[model samples]
Target chain A: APSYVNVQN
Target chain B: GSMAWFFGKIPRAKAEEMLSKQRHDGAFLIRESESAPGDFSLSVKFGNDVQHFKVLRDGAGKYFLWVVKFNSLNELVDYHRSTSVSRNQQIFLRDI
Candidate 1:
């Protein structure tokens, strides 16, 4: 599974 | 043999520690992904915290996080040095 971190709201 | 920024096989926790130690926006390092075997993760500092983005490879062995594919890990990071990653937020790579 690819991890994602969104700095944007 | 290549970029010192590429910290091979280190855990996510270690990556976080390294970036936080520097404590600056865009300070980053590339690490082998712990969660996804055979892939990489881009760990970068934004504001007060670090964010991780998974780097995937295609059948041709080109690396990319989203659309743009790169020949090598170094090239990928180099390309992002000036280019922003997010649409709503500006994210660039900077050496630690």
Candidate 2:
């Protein structure tokens, strides 16, 4: 399972 | 939030050599009380104070040194360098 991730431009 | 327990060993000959001094500033000065052929008390001075430890014997060679107390890792390394090479050392739960 994946906890979370960071998204940015 | 951390501590250390330094321990090591040295031969009697080396022990005698280290025990010659009694006072020190940044480094440790080790001392031992004159006793019988096989018995002696050990202590070290550092950081304005001195702490004592006891000597234990093995089969035929090597004596175990209890440890020296330090406040932090930096001080710990200072004590380590201040100590003579008994060959090996290990540290665990040491408190200031």
Candidate 3:
């Protein structure tokens, strides 16, 4: 499973 | 991820900040996009010290430049210019 990354800005 | 979101930009955040981006998808997802950052520019008019501080704190803590997925054509470009406490940061245009 690909890790989900949250790009917070 | 475009401009930094510091905590100081709260309660009328006094910091100048701006962000622009282009995405492959219609939905506003952080992934697979082109982003840009620029000076908030509006901070000076606000004239709020506490707000500025909060905005900076918030941005430094959580803001990011880009988020990518494996083998995806998703790309993002971002730029940010800020002047606070005598500190300035700038991000220019370049291929990501």
Candidate 4:
């Protein structure tokens, strides 16, 4: 399983 | 799972990352598209936990958490992502 972190507003 | 992540997202989820997120938010929004994923299972061990904890997690795995504050009218908002998964089942869980 591949995953990345991101931030949204 | 395609959308924005504030500081995360704009990427992809393998089985592991997705699994981790799922396991984290399980028991909250496993199949739903919008809801809080915190304090449910995964977020409890991963994401931030606070008053918004419920709000955050609630949106992580389910659909929207109407919140009214300071006499503000009803606020309806859904999780950032559009989809989520766990193990093999498509479960909704916010990414940490």
Which candidate has the highest lDDT of all? 1
iRMSD per model? 4.4, 26.3, 12.8, 11.0
Q: Residue-wise lDDT of candidate 2 within B2-82, one digit each (tens)? A: 323222345434443453353443223232333434343334434444334444444554454434444433453455454
Query: lDDT for model 2, on a 0 to 1 scale?
Result: 0.36
- Model 1: per-residue Cα lDDT at residue A7: 20
Which is better, 1 or 4, measured by DockQ?
Answer: 1
What lDDT is reached at residue B41 by model 1? 85
lDDT of each: 0.81, 0.36, 0.22, 0.26
DockQ values, each candidate: 0.35, 0.01, 0.03, 0.04
Model 4 per-residue lDDT tens digits across residues B1-96: 543222221112222234344335422222111232221211212332111122222323432323322221011112323343222334343434
Give TM-scores for every candidate, taking all chains together and pairing residue i with residue i.
0.84, 0.30, 0.14, 0.17
State each candidate's chain A TM-score.
Answer: 0.36, 0.12, 0.28, 0.40
Give per-residue CA lDDT, model 3, range B65-95, as digits (tens): 3322222112222222221221332222222
Most DockQ-accurate candidate? 1
Worst 10 residues of 1 chain B by lDDT: B84-93
